[PDB]
Design a protein around this nucleic acid. Structure first.
Ligand SMILES: [Mg+2]
Ligand SMILES: [Mg+2]
Ligand SMILES: [Mg+2]
Ligand SMILES: [Mg+2]
Ligand SMILES: [Mg+2]
Ligand SMILES: [Mg+2]
Ligand SMILES: [Mg+2]
Ligand SMILES: [Mg+2]
Ligand SMILES: [Mg+2]
Ligand SMILES: [Mg+2]
Ligand SMILES: [Mg+2]
Ligand SMILES: [Mg+2]
Ligand SMILES: [Mg+2]
Lengths: 153, 50, 107, 60, 61, 63, 354
RNA sequence: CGCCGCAGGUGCAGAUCUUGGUGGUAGUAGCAAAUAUUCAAACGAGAACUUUGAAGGCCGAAGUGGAGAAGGGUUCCAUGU
């Protein structure tokens, strides 16, 4: 399929993709920006720590109302959170990409996340009931995710 | 209710019998254009006329 | 060794001070589990059902002040789990808590 | 147990079963199903075995 | 094997009704086979016997 | 696994409430096979299903 | 861990006993069948001999279940297999020149010796059987020799299927689509290790790949028609069922419950026939088979006027050359074909006896 | 499609314009009426929420109990996802 940012050469690279994933787009975008450029083992450890609330993802663009935490100081930031669902979805996508690297025969102890992108998926319609006989939307905001890992050591 | 007339019962029976999904072999027919039964009625959402 | 077993007494009163009425026994169980984790260093702590009963003996808000428990660190060598060892905490009925030490017990 | 015409009464069902299966029946109970088909429970006379009759009919 | 209307018209009322009765008991047996599983051949024979009944009744009428 | 049907059937057969039906926590796989009231009766005879006694309400204080 | 394999001489001897007993029953049946006989009588007789002889054998041990491992099954010119009519069913009378297919199995200590053979009835002395049917039986026997020669540890289960397809095409016929041979172990007739005959895409993708192993029994089956290789049902009663010991359901009818208990007592896991009971059996079986307590063996019919043949025999696989314990009475003098083998490899495998 | 003529339902930023779609707000308001949960096990990829057992509680017979009328119409009951 068509990824944006095709790799420099697709011999030492592997790809992973997911569509219409039911995670919040804003949380996933922040998590992906956190893990972008990491070595794969470091990124896996980081995502597990995010699930354990030992390391946080910094909320840099979608930070309206996001609280402060001590662990955002690792980044040059003040506002951070621990998106468990985003961390789990990205961990699953990382494992899929590592299996793709195994299939391509390129060693996984040198993989580095060179590209990761979170797009908005089509929204899903639900309903909420308001005060004076009114109906309001209760949309879900799912996301497509794509990632390209590359050997570099 | 438990007390119902024969006409009411027969009307409910017809509305029951036509509230079923399309057969799967229908979509394999030539020039079908039908995907799913759009006349499905759930007892809690849409109430019958009677 | 790591199949050790010891008898402790827990100051439930000290760990439960300040908690609202409807959360005192649940918080006492959370505090017992946290105590076992701090003592034996194993994340997997199994509260005995008799110990749970002892904690809930006087209702939800009038938790006993002191509870004598026994921590038995055992092997989890029965399945594939991240935790190699688990601590099972049981209830030790006592008549008084005066002069009660932490004691190593035998199998 | 039979599925019968919704317009047939108990006497008609009894006589029809008797004629087209060569059996004697004791009583007929009748209900109309929620799907609109009439169902008849036809009890057979003591000297007729409903198991053997169902075997001859072929519905075992 | 099938019956035709052109070779039914030479026959009398008694044997026409006999033919009708045979077709009717055959159709009842086919419906029994339909509800007890049966086979595709017996399921496809239902329409043939129904049309034969219609044909005999049309000739009689 | 899931024993909602068996608890309902045992309550009906024992003619008590579901409060009083005791299903053996260890014989879960055996009880789960009982999809009929006669199987429930067999389990009751075998002691895998037990009718619990009435919770005590004493009138001694009143007397 | 407690399974019994061919490592024991007692196992060897009772396998030989099962082979001999199946052979003698089939030898009696091929002679007993003649013109103007009834398949009901043949099936009753085939069971009748087997019962008495299995009862008299091992008279010093009356704790083990031994007897029929597969009921007597007759298939004459229109049926594939799994055919065994009851007394109530319309019988089939043997005419002149019919080719019939016999299937029968015996079990000792849960171990199976199951054999099937196709032969023509009422053959005159000095005559030659000629026709399009004269090649399908001969090709089935050539498949028998091929399977005997090629059954060996290291030869894959996807090779016997292609050899059988090759000889079938060499005889300008094809086997019935989707038939399974199995690896036979104690108290098992439907083992996980399966061999497949004339497959298609669905059965090939659902089939497994395996390597033949030492100390095991196979029931290699050749079953070949002379037409197109397709079969269906013609609205006839299924008569063969086998109790599946995997799954369980609570039977809510007294008749079904008694029938299932009797099945457990007599034919615990081996296939049986409804002839061995009837009035209440025909009613119990429907409730039992509704919840997959009994796997059925439906009757399959080829097209009218077609001819189909079959051979099958339990072959043990020992380290220094497999042996045949059940053999059918097929002679090349009284049976020839208008076409022979045109494959060099097939000639090489058929000319080498085991 | 160009050129010569012909003919228009012929040019949009507005009309609290019509229909459709999409933003910021905003990962925000909020998911706070009726006292309350806890321990162990099972199934399961996965358990605060399912099931069983144990405990602590509530409804407290004008019930959060057991049955009906009207109304609903298959929601009933198993099995599976
Ligand atoms: Mg704000
Ligand atoms: Mg706020
Ligand atoms: Mg609202
Ligand atoms: Mg309103
Ligand atoms: Mg409503
Ligand atoms: Mg009535
Ligand atoms: Mg205009
Ligand atoms: Mg505009
Ligand atoms: Mg303007
Ligand atoms: Mg908020
Ligand atoms: Mg709130
Ligand atoms: Mg109260
Ligand atoms: Mg009520």
């Amino acid at each position: 399929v068509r990824y944006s940012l095709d790799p420099e050469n697709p011999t030492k690279s592997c790809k992973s993709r997911g569509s219409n994933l039911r995670v919040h787009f804003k949380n996933t975008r922040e998590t992906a920006q956190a893990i972008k450029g990491m070595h794969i083992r470091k990124a896996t450890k980081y995502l597990k720590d995010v699930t354990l609330q030992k390391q946080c993802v910094p909320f840099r663009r979608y930070n309206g109302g996001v609280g402060r935490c001590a662990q955002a100081k690792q980044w040059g930031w003040t506002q951070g959170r621990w998106p468990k669902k985003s961390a789990e979805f990205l961990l699953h996508m990382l494992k899929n990409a590592e299996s793709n690297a195994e299939l391509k025969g390129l060693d996984v102890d040198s993989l580095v996340i060179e590209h990761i992108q979170v797009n908005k998926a089509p929204k899903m319609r639900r309903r909420t009931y308001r005060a004076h006989g009114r109906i309001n939307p209760y949309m879900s905001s799912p996301c497509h995710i794509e990632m390209i890992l590359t050997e570099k050591e | 209710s438990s007390h119902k007339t024969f006409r009411i019962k027969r009307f409910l029976a017809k509305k029951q019998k036509q509230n079923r999904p399309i057969p799967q072999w229908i979509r394999m027919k030539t020039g079908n254009k039908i995907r799913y039964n759009s006349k499905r009625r759930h007892w809690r959402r849409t109430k019958l006329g009677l | 060794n790591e199949v050790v077993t010891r008898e402790y007494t827990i100051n439930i009163h000290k760990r439960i001070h300040g908690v609202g009425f409807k959360k005192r026994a649940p918080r006492a169980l959370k505090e017992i589990r946290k105590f076992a984790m701090k003592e034996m260093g194993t994340p997997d702590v199994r509260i005995d059902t008799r110990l749970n009963k002892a904690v809930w003996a006087k209702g939800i808000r009038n938790v006993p002040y002191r509870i004598r428990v026994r921590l038995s660190r055992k092997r989890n060598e029965d399945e594939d789990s991240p935790n190699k060892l688990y601590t099972l905490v049981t209830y030790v009925p006592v008549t008084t808590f005066k002069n009660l030490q932490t004691v190593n017990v035998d199998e | 147990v039979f599925i019968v015409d919704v317009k047939a009464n108990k006497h008609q069902i009894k006589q029809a079963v008797k004629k087209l299966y060569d059996i004697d029946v004791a009583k007929v109970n009748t209900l109309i199903r929620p799907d609109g088909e009439k169902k008849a429970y036809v009890r057979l006379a003591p000297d007729y075995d409903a198991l053997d009759v169902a075997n001859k009919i072929g519905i075992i | 094997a099938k019956i035709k209307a052109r070779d039914l018209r030479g026959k009398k009322k008694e044997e026409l009704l006999k033919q009708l009765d045979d077709l009717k008991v055959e159709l009842s047996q086919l419906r029994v086979a339909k509800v007890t599983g049966g086979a595709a051949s017996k399921l496809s024979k239902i329409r043939v016997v129904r049309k034969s009944i219609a044909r005999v009744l049309t000739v009689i009428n | 696994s899931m024993l909602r049907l068996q608890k309902r059937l045992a309550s009906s057969v024992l003619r008590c409430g579901k409060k009083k039906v005791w299903l053996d926590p260890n014989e879960t796989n055996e009880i789960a096979n009982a999809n009929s009231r006669q199987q429930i009766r067999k389990l009751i005879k075998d002691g895998l299903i037990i009718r619990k006694p009435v919770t005590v309400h004493s009138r001694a204080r009143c007397r | 861990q407690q399974e019994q394999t061919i490592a024991e001489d007692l196992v060897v001897t009772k396998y030989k006993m099962g082979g001999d007993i199946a052979n003698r029953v089939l030898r009696s049946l091929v002679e007993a069948s003649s013109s103007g006989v009834s398949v009901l009588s043949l099936c009753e007789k085939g069971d009748a001999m087997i019962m008495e002889e299995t009862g008299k054998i091992f008279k010093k041990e009356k704790e083990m279940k031994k007897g029929i491992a597969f009921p007597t099954s007759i298939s004459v010119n229109n049926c594939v297999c799994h055919f065994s009519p009851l007394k109530s069913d319309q019988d089939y009378i043997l005419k002149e020149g019919d080719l019939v297919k016999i299937d029968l199995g015996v079990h000792v200590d849960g171990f199976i010796a199951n054999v099937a053979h196709t032969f023509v009835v009422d053959v005159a002395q000095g005559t030659q059987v000629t026709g399009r049917k004269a090649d399908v039986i001969k090709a089935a026997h050539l498949c028998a020799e091929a399977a005997l020669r090629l059954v060996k540890p290291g030869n894959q289960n996807t090779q016997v299927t292609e050899a059988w397809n090759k000889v079938a095409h060499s005889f300008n016929c094809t086997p019935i689509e989707g038939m399974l041979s199995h690896q036979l172990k104690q108290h098992v007739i439907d083992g996980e290790k399966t061999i497949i005959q004339n497959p298609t895409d669905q059965q090939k993708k659902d089939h497994e790949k395996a390597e033949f192993e030492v100390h095991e029994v196979y029931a290699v089956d050749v079953l070949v028609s002379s037409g197109e290789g397709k079969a269906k049902d013609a609205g006839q009663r299924t008569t063969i069922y086998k109790r599946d010991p995997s799954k369980q359901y609570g039977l809510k009818m007294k008749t079904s419950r008694a029938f299932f208990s009797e099945v457990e007592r007599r034919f615990d896991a081996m296939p049986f026939t409804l002839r061995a009971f009837e009035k209440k059996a025909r009613m119990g079986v429907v409730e039992c088979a509704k919840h997959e307590l009994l796997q059925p063996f439906n009757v399959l019919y080829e097209k009218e006027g077609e001819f189909v043949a079959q051979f099958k025999f339990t072959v043990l696989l020992m380290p220094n050359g497999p042996m045949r314990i059940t053999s059918g009475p097929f002679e090349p003098d009284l049976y020839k074909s208008e076409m022979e083998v045109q494959d060099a490899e097939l000639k090489a495998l058929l000319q080498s006896s085991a």
